[PDB]
Amino acid sequence: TRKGYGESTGKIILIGEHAVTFGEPAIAVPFNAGKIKVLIEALESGNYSSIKSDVYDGMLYDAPDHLKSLVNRFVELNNITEPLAVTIQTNLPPSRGLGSSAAVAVAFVRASYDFLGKSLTKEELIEKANWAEQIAHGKPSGIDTQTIVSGKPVWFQKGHAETLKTLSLDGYMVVIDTGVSTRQAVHPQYMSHVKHIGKLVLRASDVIEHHKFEALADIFNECHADLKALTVSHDKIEQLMKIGKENGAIAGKLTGAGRGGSMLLLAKDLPTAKNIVKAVEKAGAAHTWIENLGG
Ligand SMILES: [Cl-]
Secondary structure, eight states: OOEEEEEEEEEEEEEEBTTOOTTSOEEEEEEEEEEEEEEEEEOOTTOOOEEEEEEOSSOOOOTTSOHHHHHHHHHHHTTOOSOEEEEEEEOOOTTSSSOHHHHHHHHHHHHHHHHHTOOOOHHHHHHHHHHHHHHHHSSOOHHHHHHHHHTSOEEEETTEEEEOSOOOBSSEEEEEEOOOOOSOOOOOOHHHHHHHHHHHHHHHHHHHHTTOHHHHHHHHHHHHHHHHHHSOOOHHHHHHHHHHHHTTOSEEEESBTTTOSSEEEEESSHHHHHHHHHHHHHTTOSEEEEEEOBO
16 A cells, blocks of 8 residues: 545535535535645655645635644554655635535545555545544535535535536636635625525526526526625625626626625636636736636
């Protein structure tokens, strides 16, 4: 058992609250633009063991995600006596709802099994990743782990949950992170907004099942207007969406029922998504990604 490699995507809650739990409405999909890579290497004779975390771009480390706990556990459970070099690379900012804790956990578990030479089933990965999230981060995310592992959208509604077929919408989504204090720039009559996104998640499920990009655009714009109608809004965020639309975004909303971990903008084609990115970065957007929606 000498060397093991694992990868994971992130995830986005297109519509629905942050850290959603079963029983609450949501639509989560894989975030293929976000990548976490873990490498576990056995070393020789007598070298020190190391854990190295590489963060790409000017993003902060995810301090709440305690990877040292995952490695300690892995070394003790498997009676590993040899020096290990563990490397984690991440594309994802912390605490923006991009599925960072779950991504690290899925990547780490994959790497672990690959290292031990062990076969890894989906349900086994699901169980081990959910357990690793609990240990490393203090709670699992069932929706994030299932969306990530399956590579399929997961839909929550009322008293049931389903895994849909692979995402296929003929279009693009620009994902914007508004950045930082060290703590993230995230954000009563809010109950009625959450009540309303419930019905919007129901329409989104059918819209996604039938590959209707225009209708998802409608739903995004309805979500946003509903939020703004019912809550005190913020000039700097709205101006960023205004800049995205001025540059070809046909729709916009915040993730997490107005928490705003990400801003999501919908574009018809790749060139327009590249134009949105540049205009929004120029206007201060801290980090951006372009997601092909698979059509
Ligand atoms: Cl969020």
